[PDB]
Amino acid sequence: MKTIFSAICPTGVITIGRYIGALRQFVELQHEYNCYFCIADQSAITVWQDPHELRQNIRRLAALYLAVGIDPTQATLFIASEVPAHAQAAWMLQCIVYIGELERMTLFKELSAGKEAVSAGLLTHPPIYAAMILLYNTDIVPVGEYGKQLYELTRDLAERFNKRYGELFTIPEARIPKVGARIMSLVDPTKSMYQSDPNPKAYITLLDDAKTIEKKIKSAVTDSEGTIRYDKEAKPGISNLLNIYSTLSGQSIEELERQYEGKGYGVFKADLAQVVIETLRPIQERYHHWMESEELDRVLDEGAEKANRVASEMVRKMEQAMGLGRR
Amino acid sequence: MKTIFSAICPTGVITIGRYIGALRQFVELQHEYNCYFCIADQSAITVWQDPHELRQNIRRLAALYLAVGIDPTQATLFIASEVPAHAQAAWMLQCIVYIGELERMTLFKELSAGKEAVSAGLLTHPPIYAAMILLYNTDIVPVGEYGKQLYELTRDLAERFNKRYGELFTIPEARIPKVGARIMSLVDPTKSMYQSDPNPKAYITLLDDAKTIEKKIKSAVTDSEGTIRYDKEAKPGISNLLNIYSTLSGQSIEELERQYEGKGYGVFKADLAQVVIETLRPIQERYHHWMESEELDRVLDEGAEKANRVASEMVRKMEQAMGLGRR
């Protein structure tokens, strides 16, 4: 077996673009790998978070991950802050990393620069992230779009601590995003669907109701020609809709082109909306069921007991190697 | 009962200076305040530390503190790293502090700036310290020499936190050290006594044996004169050794002037070494007995439960205030 570790910030929403190019994969992957799904509450508070909202979100996300198909008998689903080890290890690691290394993190440079007062959270989060990964002997890590610098630093740190106090950390390898394209924005198919899009018309959320999925799907920017055929360059919006239909229906794009021969955007967009709805119907019913069950707390409890057991012993190894404590 | 909290960095030697002007008092204070003596191993590693050596000093400091008279029944002796709440809390405070505040730190601007290869624990250390202090609802903190900045920063963070999330923390008050001429150099009568002094004949490790106590005492700088009289300025060597005689042996300086009138720098450095060695003898006696006993471990355990029972409850009150985790 190999171990995959996935960190989810309990902030924001889940677009079908993240459900399709990332999250839904794991419903199978959990059966081929040792999978960790960790809710990074601790990474959330590096910027202001309304305590009541944050606590709510941590819980929603957990329900959604379960509704979507993550199996807590085969995977470990847990909240970071419930594993004290994560802060323990991030401090050791904070003592290994140089200031420069953090200071030239792009993401820090972005949301820091300009502003005059910034929390040391944004600057020192990486060790916290890298500690989440290395603590469990993580063979494989999801990287995707922005995460390149983070991955690379986690890999450097794991190396650097290994060349010093000895070899203890597995060097994680970045995971290969599957064959396929990004899911684009419904109001500008020249850009990827992001949840941080100003315009809520651009993305669809796993929690959206029938009416909204309709509006957002029907309002999706097409083209002047009138044929349902795939061509990213010439017909990006209509291509992107074929792409979504294809991944959620299980039919090929070539099957779809033929099925809608001499048909037009109207029925095609209405059909597409039923597909998206049919997909989110069971996910949402299950979602609500989880939010109404103590079985939810029960599952997160079991989650943490697993992680602690695994991560504490790794904290013990790190201490017994730098020379902290006793034993 | 007001609570004092003292963090001791497990790195090197306790000169008699720190004994006479700091540590000895606490043998008394422990009876009138609720005291915490925390061996700050977690803080040690902001710089390179040899594992074996580091892990020795931790053991040593704990012995030495017990040896000198620190009663584990009245106070609470403990190693930091053994209390996971210090790490947890330090991450939270890291998210609340300003890169501005950590970067203006004299201690920091001093022991870096050349080269451009500096740890990050070194810049993010204040929040770690703050967290030790605030975790225990500490009412008083020893400051003195170079802590005004670190003490001030703790106050700020404790108010900023209460301000944002509710009033949780006690705002630490600074205990100004007692009025008593600092212990000066044995080679440089006009300069104080720190363990940083290159000249190893300038200071006297609490753990020194008689043969070396002879050399350092009887080879201590004075003046070409020959009368036993106090004058920190003109007789800076004698006035030092004189001060040292007073506090240790018990008799005032003036009384020792009348007893050492008609005498010189031969008999006055004859008995001084006799008092130092006589005063250090039972210390090392009890010291070595701690070092060799399984009891030093049974105390540090008990110490840790004591500390972990208070510290982790606070962490829970924090997480509740910030939104983190559950329940």
XYZ file of C-alpha atoms in Angstrom:
654
model
C 0.000 0.000 0.000
C 0.936 3.645 -0.486
C -0.361 6.539 1.610
C -2.071 9.549 0.073
C -2.588 12.647 2.215
C -5.146 15.303 1.256
C -5.539 18.630 3.102
C -8.835 20.480 2.790
C -9.196 24.062 3.991
C -12.587 24.270 5.723
C -13.172 27.631 4.037
C -15.416 28.353 1.036
C -17.377 25.990 -1.245
C -16.912 22.943 -3.475
C -17.427 23.628 -7.229
C -18.305 20.698 -9.544
C -15.013 21.612 -11.108
C -13.362 20.446 -7.875
C -15.781 17.553 -7.589
C -14.903 16.377 -11.109
C -11.161 16.911 -11.434
C -10.204 16.014 -7.877
C -12.689 15.022 -5.191
C -14.680 12.376 -7.045
C -11.534 10.436 -7.965
C -10.926 9.629 -4.296
C -14.168 7.768 -3.944
C -12.267 5.040 -5.780
C -8.714 5.912 -4.720
C -9.556 5.256 -1.061
C -9.644 1.600 -2.126
C -6.224 1.523 -3.755
C -4.366 3.711 -1.260
C -4.154 4.560 2.395
C -5.976 7.865 2.254
C -5.990 10.760 4.687
C -8.615 13.447 4.359
C -7.665 16.167 6.825
C -9.746 19.285 7.501
C -7.138 22.019 7.924
C -8.992 24.254 10.370
C -5.533 25.334 11.643
C -4.569 26.720 8.230
C -7.854 28.689 8.092
C -7.106 31.005 11.030
C -4.033 32.534 9.395
C -6.513 35.141 8.185
C -9.525 36.399 10.083
C -12.365 33.845 10.419
C -15.686 34.402 12.131
C -15.554 31.824 14.875
C -19.164 30.853 14.528
C -18.900 30.480 10.739
C -15.600 28.605 10.902
C -16.928 26.053 13.322
C -19.976 25.549 11.146
C -17.888 25.048 8.032
C -15.529 22.514 9.519
C -18.609 20.397 10.101
C -20.307 20.939 6.690
C -17.194 19.976 4.807
C -16.899 16.771 6.841
C -20.512 15.922 5.953
C -19.958 16.629 2.297
C -16.797 14.502 2.092
C -18.844 11.666 3.589
C -21.890 12.323 1.378
C -19.690 12.323 -1.716
C -18.462 8.813 -0.988
C -15.438 8.862 1.315
C -15.562 5.708 3.455
C -14.432 6.222 7.093
C -13.800 2.464 7.456
C -11.222 2.663 4.647
C -10.011 6.209 4.990
C -9.131 8.575 7.783
C -11.192 11.734 8.020
C -10.232 14.122 10.809
C -9.832 17.746 11.929
C -6.192 18.915 12.146
C -6.619 20.835 15.355
C -7.686 17.582 17.016
C -4.186 16.218 16.434
C -1.860 18.294 18.694
C 1.058 16.633 16.898
C 0.499 18.881 13.840
C 1.456 22.006 15.849
C 4.210 20.009 17.576
C 5.859 19.072 14.305
C 5.319 22.423 12.591
C 7.448 23.996 15.308
C 10.375 21.584 14.817
C 10.069 22.221 11.077
C 9.779 25.929 11.693
C 13.256 25.611 13.264
C 14.630 23.876 10.158
C 13.391 26.229 7.454
C 15.275 29.467 6.658
C 13.458 32.810 6.707
C 14.251 33.444 3.054
C 12.572 30.212 2.004
C 9.262 31.405 3.511
C 9.766 35.047 2.469
C 9.950 34.118 -1.229
C 6.876 31.937 -1.134
C 4.773 33.402 -3.922
C 1.467 33.151 -2.063
C 2.876 34.991 0.935
C 4.302 37.696 -1.403
C 0.845 38.061 -2.966
C -1.493 38.538 0.016
C 1.200 40.266 2.069
C 2.744 42.886 -0.191
C 1.172 46.324 -0.315
C -0.420 45.932 3.111
C 1.543 47.241 6.110
C 0.441 44.889 8.904
C 0.220 41.162 8.197
C -0.103 38.207 10.598
C 2.906 35.878 10.830
C 0.455 33.148 9.839
C 0.650 33.750 6.092
C 4.450 33.673 6.418
C 4.870 30.531 8.449
C 1.980 28.377 7.296
C 4.187 26.139 5.110
C 5.916 24.362 7.994
C 2.372 23.721 9.269
C 1.437 22.291 5.873
C 4.663 20.297 5.449
C 4.199 18.906 8.943
C 0.749 17.655 7.982
C 2.226 15.669 5.136
C 5.477 14.301 6.584
C 3.943 13.176 9.901
C 2.129 10.286 8.254
C 4.924 9.035 5.926
C 3.169 10.314 2.882
C 4.162 8.646 -0.357
C 1.881 10.744 -2.548
C 0.482 14.281 -2.403
C -2.173 16.136 -4.513
C -0.606 19.243 -6.022
C -2.597 20.645 -8.914
C -2.542 24.296 -9.929
C -1.003 26.668 -7.379
C 0.539 24.209 -4.907
C 3.836 23.735 -6.746
C 5.950 25.866 -4.414
C 4.462 24.297 -1.288
C 5.063 20.762 -2.544
C 8.680 21.603 -3.399
C 9.342 23.051 0.081
C 7.754 20.095 1.917
C 10.058 17.910 -0.164
C 13.115 20.066 0.639
C 12.334 20.083 4.394
C 11.818 16.335 4.525
C 15.200 16.025 2.820
C 16.963 18.617 5.011
C 15.780 17.060 8.279
C 16.840 13.697 6.861
C 20.415 14.741 5.970
C 20.804 16.179 9.474
C 19.200 14.214 12.346
C 19.011 11.127 10.089
C 16.543 9.557 7.631
C 13.011 9.458 9.021
C 10.717 11.237 6.564
C 9.356 9.721 3.369
C 9.855 12.065 0.439
C 6.362 12.577 -0.979
C 5.757 12.484 -4.758
C 3.360 14.840 -6.529
C 0.302 13.197 -8.035
C -0.421 13.200 -11.758
C -3.759 14.892 -12.493
C -5.747 12.490 -14.733
C -6.326 12.832 -18.500
C -8.897 15.575 -19.100
C -9.213 19.337 -19.111
C -10.213 21.832 -16.454
C -13.880 22.616 -15.922
C -14.204 26.203 -17.133
C -16.270 29.132 -15.860
C -19.841 29.192 -17.120
C -19.612 32.970 -17.810
C -16.126 32.988 -19.358
C -15.110 29.534 -20.723
C -11.708 31.008 -21.449
C -11.006 30.722 -17.709
C -11.061 27.820 -15.230
C -14.026 27.524 -12.867
C -12.838 28.931 -9.532
C -14.875 29.367 -6.361
C -13.115 32.670 -5.780
C -14.819 34.103 -8.861
C -16.448 37.553 -8.310
C -19.423 36.385 -10.358
C -21.413 33.577 -8.706
C -22.780 32.679 -12.169
C -19.422 31.163 -13.183
C -19.366 28.208 -10.762
C -21.798 25.539 -9.574
C -21.634 24.330 -6.010
C -22.259 20.773 -4.805
C -24.895 22.257 -2.472
C -26.872 24.239 -5.082
C -30.622 23.676 -5.419
C -32.451 22.687 -8.602
C -33.488 26.233 -9.509
C -29.958 27.657 -9.356
C -28.391 24.784 -11.319
C -31.004 25.590 -13.989
C -30.291 29.341 -14.076
C -26.513 28.963 -14.011
C -26.533 26.213 -16.633
C -29.041 27.948 -18.929
C -27.220 31.271 -18.597
C -23.863 29.736 -19.575
C -22.163 31.633 -22.424
C -22.295 29.732 -25.723
C -21.624 30.921 -29.281
C -23.306 32.264 -32.404
C -23.045 29.123 -34.483
C -25.576 26.485 -33.449
C -23.944 23.062 -33.354
C -23.101 20.986 -30.325
C -19.599 19.887 -31.271
C -16.289 19.906 -29.379
C -13.683 22.532 -30.165
C -11.921 24.128 -27.208
C -10.511 26.975 -29.297
C -13.456 27.912 -31.475
C -16.306 26.769 -29.225
C -14.937 26.881 -25.644
C -18.187 27.428 -23.749
C -20.055 24.730 -25.616
C -17.003 22.457 -25.434
C -16.865 22.979 -21.671
C -20.541 22.031 -21.373
C -19.924 18.865 -23.392
C -17.021 18.166 -21.081
C -19.195 18.433 -17.923
C -22.029 16.385 -19.496
C -19.507 13.737 -20.578
C -17.859 13.251 -17.168
C -21.136 13.159 -15.248
C -23.102 10.961 -17.666
C -20.477 8.434 -18.538
C -21.005 9.005 -22.223
C -18.186 10.016 -24.512
C -18.041 13.438 -26.116
C -18.294 11.738 -29.497
C -21.416 9.956 -28.301
C -22.864 13.314 -27.247
C -22.022 15.125 -30.516
C -24.008 12.472 -32.384
C -26.855 12.413 -29.883
C -27.451 16.132 -30.344
C -27.023 16.228 -34.102
C -29.361 18.842 -35.524
C -30.378 19.717 -31.998
C -29.698 23.060 -30.385
C -28.306 24.649 -27.239
C -31.737 24.908 -25.637
C -32.602 21.262 -25.027
C -28.920 20.475 -24.694
C -28.642 22.919 -21.781
C -31.862 21.694 -20.223
C -30.715 18.098 -20.496
C -27.342 19.088 -19.053
C -29.092 20.652 -16.059
C -31.041 17.479 -15.311
C -27.779 15.549 -15.349
C -26.138 17.884 -12.867
C -29.219 17.774 -10.669
C -29.459 13.984 -10.815
C -25.865 13.908 -9.674
C -26.265 16.229 -6.700
C -29.616 14.770 -5.552
C -28.187 11.758 -3.688
C -25.093 13.688 -2.586
C -27.297 16.305 -0.921
C -29.781 13.879 0.660
C -26.858 12.000 2.167
C -25.242 15.282 3.150
C -28.272 16.330 5.183
C -28.514 12.899 6.705
C -24.976 13.234 8.022
C -25.656 16.692 9.462
C -28.496 15.210 11.472
C -26.535 12.341 12.916
C -24.304 11.888 15.928
C -22.726 9.275 13.703
C -21.011 12.336 12.213
C -19.263 13.189 15.479
C -18.658 9.492 15.992
C -16.819 9.231 12.638
C -14.650 12.314 13.251
C -13.808 10.969 16.710
C -12.592 7.662 15.264
C -10.768 9.707 12.667
C -8.680 11.634 15.194
C -7.893 8.561 17.322
C -6.277 7.003 14.207
C -4.297 10.087 13.223
C -3.056 10.844 16.749
C -1.872 7.285 17.188
C 0.044 7.574 13.913
C 1.261 11.180 14.233
C 2.266 11.225 17.898
C 4.681 8.312 17.470
C 6.242 10.303 14.671
C 6.488 13.292 16.958
C 8.287 10.999 19.436
C 10.781 9.960 16.711
C 11.472 13.574 15.814
C 12.092 14.568 19.412
C 14.317 11.553 20.072
C 16.382 12.796 17.103
C 16.768 16.512 17.755
C 17.212 15.880 21.464
C 14.071 17.442 22.931
C 12.475 15.881 26.009
C 13.474 12.598 27.644
C 13.040 8.837 27.079
C -2.368 32.954 44.979
C -0.604 34.986 42.317
C 1.239 32.865 39.761
C 4.822 33.466 38.674
C 6.107 31.633 35.596
C 9.772 31.226 34.784
C 11.061 29.812 31.521
C 14.645 28.563 31.625
C 16.509 27.814 28.417
C 18.347 24.498 28.874
C 21.619 25.738 27.411
C 24.801 25.763 29.457
C 25.758 26.932 32.909
C 24.238 28.814 35.838
C 26.855 31.269 37.125
C 26.765 32.189 40.796
C 25.595 35.578 39.543
C 22.292 34.170 38.315
C 22.203 32.112 41.517
C 22.684 35.005 43.930
C 20.569 37.529 42.057
C 17.764 35.350 40.681
C 17.591 31.642 41.452
C 18.125 31.871 45.229
C 15.118 34.159 45.717
C 12.787 31.539 44.186
C 13.625 29.032 46.879
C 11.701 31.547 48.973
C 9.127 32.807 46.386
C 7.814 29.252 45.803
C 6.248 29.461 49.242
C 4.471 32.748 48.671
C 3.485 32.397 45.001
C 2.252 29.532 42.805
C 5.430 28.935 40.751
C 6.163 27.307 37.365
C 9.701 26.397 36.382
C 9.678 25.257 32.768
C 12.749 23.938 31.015
C 12.378 25.487 27.595
C 13.733 22.772 25.330
C 11.355 23.772 22.465
C 13.019 27.222 22.522
C 16.487 25.772 22.559
C 16.309 24.583 18.965
C 15.811 27.949 17.294
C 19.564 27.438 16.776
C 21.703 24.366 16.156
C 21.847 22.087 19.211
C 23.719 18.825 19.512
C 21.088 16.245 20.455
C 23.227 14.455 23.069
C 24.409 17.683 24.709
C 20.996 19.378 24.570
C 19.331 16.323 26.091
C 21.942 16.373 28.859
C 21.368 20.001 29.916
C 17.610 19.375 30.102
C 18.409 16.596 32.529
C 20.988 18.791 34.306
C 18.917 21.967 34.705
C 16.120 19.881 36.235
C 18.581 18.367 38.668
C 20.246 21.673 39.443
C 16.895 23.405 40.108
C 15.829 20.634 42.484
C 19.300 20.609 43.976
C 19.296 24.274 44.857
C 16.091 23.882 46.838
C 13.162 24.034 44.397
C 10.491 21.916 46.055
C 8.394 19.909 43.514
C 5.560 19.747 46.086
C 5.211 23.494 46.318
C 6.015 24.341 42.694
C 5.786 22.624 39.362
C 8.908 21.597 37.497
C 8.553 20.477 33.872
C 9.965 20.153 30.388
C 8.137 22.262 27.784
C 8.061 19.835 24.920
C 6.276 17.309 27.118
C 3.238 19.631 27.144
C 1.748 19.608 23.619
C -0.416 22.619 24.448
C 2.633 24.920 24.146
C 2.805 24.083 20.453
C -0.908 24.322 19.885
C -1.202 27.677 21.612
C 1.925 29.054 19.917
C 0.403 28.491 16.457
C -2.729 30.449 17.416
C -0.678 33.371 18.770
C 1.460 33.176 15.614
C -1.683 33.917 13.616
C -2.467 36.947 15.820
C 1.001 38.576 15.811
C 2.506 40.958 13.220
C 5.597 40.201 11.152
C 6.318 43.804 12.027
C 6.428 43.035 15.746
C 8.679 39.950 15.415
C 11.078 41.775 13.108
C 11.703 44.760 15.420
C 13.023 42.378 18.068
C 16.500 43.421 19.229
C 17.345 39.838 20.218
C 16.441 38.884 16.650
C 18.075 41.795 14.762
C 21.207 41.043 16.792
C 21.918 37.317 16.456
C 21.175 37.337 12.730
C 21.844 39.997 10.087
C 24.871 38.306 8.576
C 24.535 35.819 7.342
C 21.388 35.564 5.236
C 21.034 31.978 6.475
C 18.797 32.294 9.579
C 16.197 29.919 11.111
C 12.544 30.895 11.230
C 11.992 29.661 14.801
C 14.325 32.534 15.608
C 11.907 35.139 14.233
C 8.753 33.360 15.360
C 9.997 32.630 18.840
C 8.140 35.355 20.801
C 4.713 33.705 20.153
C 6.112 30.429 21.460
C 7.223 32.250 24.633
C 4.008 34.197 24.988
C 2.157 30.911 24.762
C 4.085 29.416 27.701
C 3.271 32.438 29.805
C -0.437 32.907 28.940
C -1.335 29.206 29.085
C -1.130 29.132 32.880
C -2.974 32.327 33.747
C 0.355 33.768 34.864
C 0.135 36.903 36.981
C 3.841 37.778 37.172
C 6.860 37.230 34.958
C 10.495 37.801 35.843
C 11.936 40.312 33.417
C 15.031 42.336 34.222
C 17.893 42.613 31.749
C 16.624 42.181 28.155
C 13.030 41.047 28.454
C 11.119 44.328 28.364
C 10.505 43.786 24.656
C 9.458 40.134 24.915
C 7.406 40.929 28.022
C 5.704 43.835 26.278
C 4.962 41.706 23.223
C 3.289 39.089 25.411
C 1.072 41.757 26.989
C 0.054 43.036 23.523
C -0.794 39.539 22.228
C -2.787 38.741 25.356
C -4.836 41.896 24.918
C -5.177 41.501 21.160
C -6.478 37.981 21.758
C -8.970 38.890 24.475
C -9.923 41.879 22.306
C -10.769 39.695 19.261
C -12.187 36.504 20.795
C -13.152 37.333 24.380
C -11.347 37.858 27.663
C -9.462 34.643 28.227
C -5.954 35.634 29.297
C -4.567 37.298 32.370
C -2.380 40.235 31.446
C 1.055 39.418 32.915
C 2.652 41.926 35.290
C 6.435 42.235 35.279
C 8.419 41.455 38.442
C 11.260 43.924 38.542
C 14.377 42.202 39.926
C 15.462 43.021 43.502
C 17.728 45.967 44.331
C 21.192 44.438 44.576
C 24.391 45.287 42.744
C 24.688 42.710 39.971
C 27.500 40.212 40.416
C 30.455 41.533 38.371
C 33.338 39.882 36.468
C 36.201 38.267 38.389
C 38.553 39.408 35.639
C 36.709 42.647 34.856
C 35.471 44.150 38.171
C 33.603 46.829 36.182
C 31.637 44.429 33.955
C 28.874 41.972 34.918
C 28.974 38.162 35.068
C 27.333 36.249 32.191
C 28.127 32.733 30.955
C 28.786 34.262 27.536
C 32.130 35.625 28.747
C 34.950 33.974 26.734
C 37.271 34.299 29.719
C 36.270 31.151 31.666
C 38.016 32.574 34.733
C 35.536 35.478 34.791
C 32.525 33.448 35.941
C 31.834 30.565 38.324
C 29.566 27.727 37.193
C 27.383 26.507 40.067
C 28.810 23.090 39.235
C 32.491 24.034 39.730
C 34.717 22.028 42.129
C 36.990 23.499 44.807
C 40.201 23.253 42.724
C 38.818 25.646 40.100
C 37.052 27.833 42.655
C 40.496 28.483 44.128
C 41.954 29.672 40.811
C 39.086 32.001 39.803
C 38.669 33.565 43.266
C 42.340 33.982 44.160
C 43.098 35.206 40.634
C 40.444 37.934 40.657
C 41.153 41.546 39.654
C 41.224 44.259 42.325
C 43.462 47.287 42.880
C 47.097 47.914 43.876
C 45.887 48.999 47.339
C 45.335 46.859 50.449
C 42.241 47.821 52.467
C 38.924 45.949 52.612
C 36.425 48.712 51.796
C 33.353 49.118 49.579
C 33.627 51.324 46.499
C 32.296 49.768 43.296
C 34.118 52.492 41.358
C 37.644 52.894 42.808
C 37.996 49.446 44.421
C 35.846 47.619 41.847
C 37.437 44.214 42.360
C 37.271 44.196 46.144
C 33.810 45.791 46.184
C 32.697 42.880 44.022
C 34.223 40.046 46.046
C 32.930 41.898 49.113
C 29.354 41.943 47.817
C 29.654 38.237 47.051
C 30.885 37.515 50.591
C 27.966 39.390 52.167
C 25.006 37.731 50.447
C 26.473 34.233 50.733
C 28.000 34.104 54.231
C 25.262 36.328 55.662
C 27.171 39.067 57.452
C 26.899 42.579 55.983
C 29.695 44.142 53.925
C 30.317 46.810 56.578
C 30.588 44.168 59.300
C 33.099 42.378 57.074
C 34.955 45.664 56.688
C 35.421 45.817 60.468
C 36.319 42.134 60.561
C 38.676 42.524 57.584
C 40.151 45.839 58.657
C 43.900 45.588 59.153
C 43.868 42.806 56.574
C 44.510 42.564 52.830
C 43.997 40.561 49.630
C 45.551 37.311 50.862
C 43.313 36.260 53.748
C 40.283 37.917 52.164
C 40.585 35.666 49.116
C 41.405 32.793 51.452
C 38.071 32.592 53.223
C 35.934 33.745 50.285
C 36.817 30.556 48.422
C 36.029 28.744 51.665
C 32.526 30.242 51.685
C 31.840 29.675 47.984
C 33.002 26.056 48.224
C 31.153 25.593 51.519
C 27.995 27.049 49.967
C 28.301 24.998 46.742
C 29.170 21.720 48.500
C 25.664 20.605 49.509
C 24.250 21.882 46.214
C 26.427 19.504 44.173
C 25.798 16.881 46.886
C 22.044 16.974 46.351
C 22.671 17.621 42.635
C 24.598 14.392 41.941
C 22.058 12.460 44.012
C 19.272 13.735 41.747
C 21.262 13.056 38.632
C 21.761 9.440 39.779
C 18.187 8.849 40.987
C 15.064 7.573 39.228
C 13.269 10.232 41.256
C 14.297 13.060 38.935
C 12.155 11.297 36.335
C 9.229 10.739 38.662
C 9.160 14.467 39.378
C 9.359 15.634 35.767
C 6.472 13.296 34.998
C 4.379 14.642 37.860
C 5.401 18.124 36.796
C 4.199 17.492 33.279
C 0.745 16.189 34.294
C 0.333 19.225 36.531
C 1.299 21.502 33.647
C -0.587 19.571 30.970
C -3.798 19.614 33.042
C -3.848 23.424 33.207
C -2.307 24.113 29.793
C -4.608 21.911 27.766
C -7.735 23.284 29.375
C -6.732 26.764 28.281
C -6.065 25.497 24.726
C -9.612 24.151 24.739
C -10.977 27.592 25.853
C -8.979 29.162 23.009
C -10.102 26.786 20.264
C -13.657 27.403 21.462
C -13.092 31.141 21.174
C -11.568 30.958 17.710
C -13.973 28.455 16.168
C -11.406 25.652 15.752
C -12.457 21.980 16.080
C -15.728 21.040 17.789
C -18.152 20.651 20.669
